[model samples]
Target: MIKKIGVLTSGGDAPGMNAAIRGVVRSALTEGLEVMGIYDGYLGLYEDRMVQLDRYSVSDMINRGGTFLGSARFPEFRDENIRAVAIENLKKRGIDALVVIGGDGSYMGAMRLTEMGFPCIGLPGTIDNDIKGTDYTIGFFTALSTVVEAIDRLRDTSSSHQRISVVEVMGRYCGDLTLAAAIAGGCEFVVVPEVEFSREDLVNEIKAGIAKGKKHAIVAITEHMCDVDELAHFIEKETGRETRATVLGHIQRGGSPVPYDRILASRMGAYAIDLLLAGYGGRCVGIQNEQLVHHDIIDAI
Candidate 1:
């Protein structure tokens, strides 16, 4: 009985977000349903900033980076009054369901809307693969590739200088990116928040490698674990080797999405619309064991 649905990208923007929007719009049109593109995440919904979407609205966006629909962080959405206004905006437009694409913060808004009589489906759309219930979020592989490439480039200079380069990557509280990048980048050492290591232990490892006549060393660490600059200074002081810290910063969030992300976003997007058609809500879409699956939003968040 669903006639129209709204789609929005919330929280942090990801590379494949546009592809997912395309999947939602195209599939919804094919099912003879109207689509509304919500702007500026949850804030847009509350402010009633929307546009009618057609097949051509999402053209040539599959390989794009970041969200074309745009995204923002609206921490004020926790207020029940603010949520009510957002719900009212959708109801005014006859939007029977919603497909929210973003991280755990986005999932919370979707869950709240569903509880307030609006049907919503959430897509995992973060570069950080920290979200539970999915093996890989939409932009995870793209971000991982970015970090790996940076590390590879850094290796060149570090080897030439015969120094240790401590590279920090974005993961918030999750160590997946740093750990995976270390493994793929062939880093000499890795520091992640999930595991504990004393400063002496790290200094000793680098010292041992230097004693063995290793040309250079690369250390991959996750953000929020420690100050990369301080770590670098400590390594240089203890190991007697020049050390530098490079924070990859926001660069890891940019660039064209890889094929893996584009395909995953497409599949999850189309699957979201189908779920709405089946009169289901308060669910999150994800890929598990190469198969599309849905979990309760409460559990997912």
Candidate 2:
């Protein structure tokens, strides 16, 4: 019999977070419960940055990127005493349960709160798509869409100049972003964190492609895997062709979310409230096979 629940977006901000917030607020109110927004994630819990939210409060926010509730990082949450204080703060406000949105790091906080006898449901809301359970995380599709568009545009210019471009995308630990973009953008080769590469082989392959009438070559690499400039220089020197490096950095994290993200974020957010109302807690919700499902929080971590 939870009468109220709290929602927060933690760690990296992702597109469709606002829609998820909307889902929680509206669905909880519809179930005859109150919803409170926790700003700046766990830090907001420590600093009392919370607000009671209603449907109108989340109006006109469905198409927005990032989160309206704000988010932050708090390594201090690892301390047991701070977690104790956070639990006390939630109890003081009568927030009986919570919905946490973000990546794996965000899930660590939610999992802790759940173990401490506080109910929490996690929503995967990172661009990385690195979470283990879900086929697609909240921001992953939108980020991929962004990368493909950028790569397509680059292809036009690179083809015109007969140059080789080494394009880097954000995916430090997981190559889902880079792989998806490369396949969609028709890249000649990709260097993901999951794969090993040889510069000599890559140079020779580019030479072969050029000899066979290939006008341009696009090599997609995951960010932080290697030096983009160095890779570009090596290719240029080895192939005797003009080369350039382009890092599509934070652009992947911004902009209005696509329709798919809006729907997914909303469905997950609203379903988390349903779990709270159904006497279920300590779980995270996700979409599998286009069906909404939830799993134990500990298992998700």
Candidate 3:
């Protein structure tokens, strides 16, 4: 029987991470097992940065704003020796299984660990929600919804001042958030990595808005897709319309997670624990058909 489990939040920080950790810890506790929280991302395991999670540790965190365990970026795993060191660290702690709570990047690490004979499970948690083979990730729904709400307020301002507003949303390397936000916020133009458009197209769209007597327009761009300010300036110089650029930055990571995140976190955590117990290796717990299940880490990633 699995009695000890290790958990960690890796990759980009997102809202509802603490909730996922709480779910895994609480569920493991019900199985009469000890839970250890891995600090930092994969780097934490390599550096022996781990802690014991008790009731006090995870208390009052279901609706918490961010991850309480803290996190880090990895630049040390290029060599297999570092990976070996991480494995030795887990072995030293007597951790029989691992629960990785983070994004697609963390899933890659877990797949590596699983190939090394370490039992690992992944809990999808990121704002991007770009990971394949899953209907939802922990923080995605809430973040997108938050961006939509912000767009609503911004729209009110744009209408009042009669000035154009260019909004920059998060989703590094993926356009899911930005594209979806445009559709939800009624944006006139959207630039995503998945699609390509020329500067002329953008200018023409802005010019069209100007001709239609709509003095203000909203242009949403995915941060990784293009430079938002450059596009806004192009519009300003070409169309002679006032434009302002707003970067959402880390503010999108703040606030209590919505109900969807909380429910997904709890359910995925439970499923991750179950996968570990079943000797399922090289797999991540993902949502398919609105139910939690396992996906082959290598093939899925």
Candidate 4:
């Protein structure tokens, strides 16, 4: 018998986090259950900072960037006693279930809590798009959109200057952002974490493009691959061509939720609440085959 649940975004903040939070709150309320919003994630739980949420509370939040409930790191949670204390804090508030929206790190925390008997649901809410269970995370499309748009603008300059443009997109340890952006932006070369490449390889590609009458070349690079500036200089010196490096940086993390992300967040959020109501715990909601699905938290992590 689920009566109350809480929602929080831990780790990195995503564009559609607010939408997911709204989905959990409103849907839980519709199911005749109450919802609470946690601030700063596990730190919020440990510090006992939370607020009961209603549909009106999440109003106008669907289009917002980042988590309205906020997020933060609490490394102490790895300690069993601290994790227990955080669970106790939620229990004291009568929050029997929790919906966590974030990437793998956040999902791990949720798995721990559910193992301790606190029902926890997780939504994929990172721009990295690295979560294994879901096809796309909450902020992935928005980040992809931002990257494509930025690359398009860079291409304009690349074309005008007849220079090689090297753009770095953020993906941390994952290359999903780089791959997707490279394909969508029509980049001439792409280097992702999944594939290894040397400066010589990039130089050869650029030289070949030049031989083929390519006046401008756009290259998409994952952040972890190599130093963007160093690569740009290498390309310039090796190819004897003007080269520039543009690091997209955190700009990809900031923006309103894209249309698809808003809808995806809403669906994941509502489905998370339903998972709790159906006596499911230690699980995460994911989209597979274009359908909403729930998986055991143990398996998801």
- lDDT of each structure? 0.92, 0.90, 0.84, 0.89
Worst 10 residues of 1 by lDDT: 191-200
RMSD (CA, angstroms), candidate 3: 1.6
Cα lDDT of model 2 overall?
Answer: 0.90
Q: Give the per-residue lDDT digits (tens) of candidate 1, residues 27-128.
A: 999999999999999989989999999999898889999998789888999999999899888988999999999999999999999999899999999998
Most lDDT-accurate candidate: 1
Better of 1 and 3 by lDDT: 1
- Write model 2 residue lDDT over 1-301, tens digit each, in one string: 9998899999888889999899988999999999999989999997888999998999988999999989898999999999999999998999999999988888888888988988899999999899877888999889999999999999999999999999999979999999999999999989888978788888888999999989898999999877989989888988889999999999999878889999999899888988988888778888889899888878887
Better of 2 and 3 by TM-score: 2
Off by over 4 Å in 1: none
lDDT of 4 by residue, 155-220 (tens): 999999899999999987898999999999999899987887888877887899899999999999
Question: Model 4 off-target regions past 4 Å?
Answer: none
The residue pairs found clashing in candidate 3 are none
Q: Per-residue alpha-carbon lDDT of model 3 for 1-301, expressed as tens digits?
A: 6779899988877788988998898888877889999888788789898899987788888898778877787866656899999999989999888888887778878888887888888888889888887887788878888899989999999889887889999988778888889999999889887887787988887888789887788988888666778777877898887878888888777779999998898888877777777778778778899877677888668
CA-only RMSD, every prediction: 0.8, 0.9, 1.6, 0.9
Return the TM-score for each candidate structure.
0.98, 0.98, 0.94, 0.98
Q: Candidate 1 local accuracy as lDDT?
A: 0.92
Ranking by lDDT: 1, 2, 4, 3
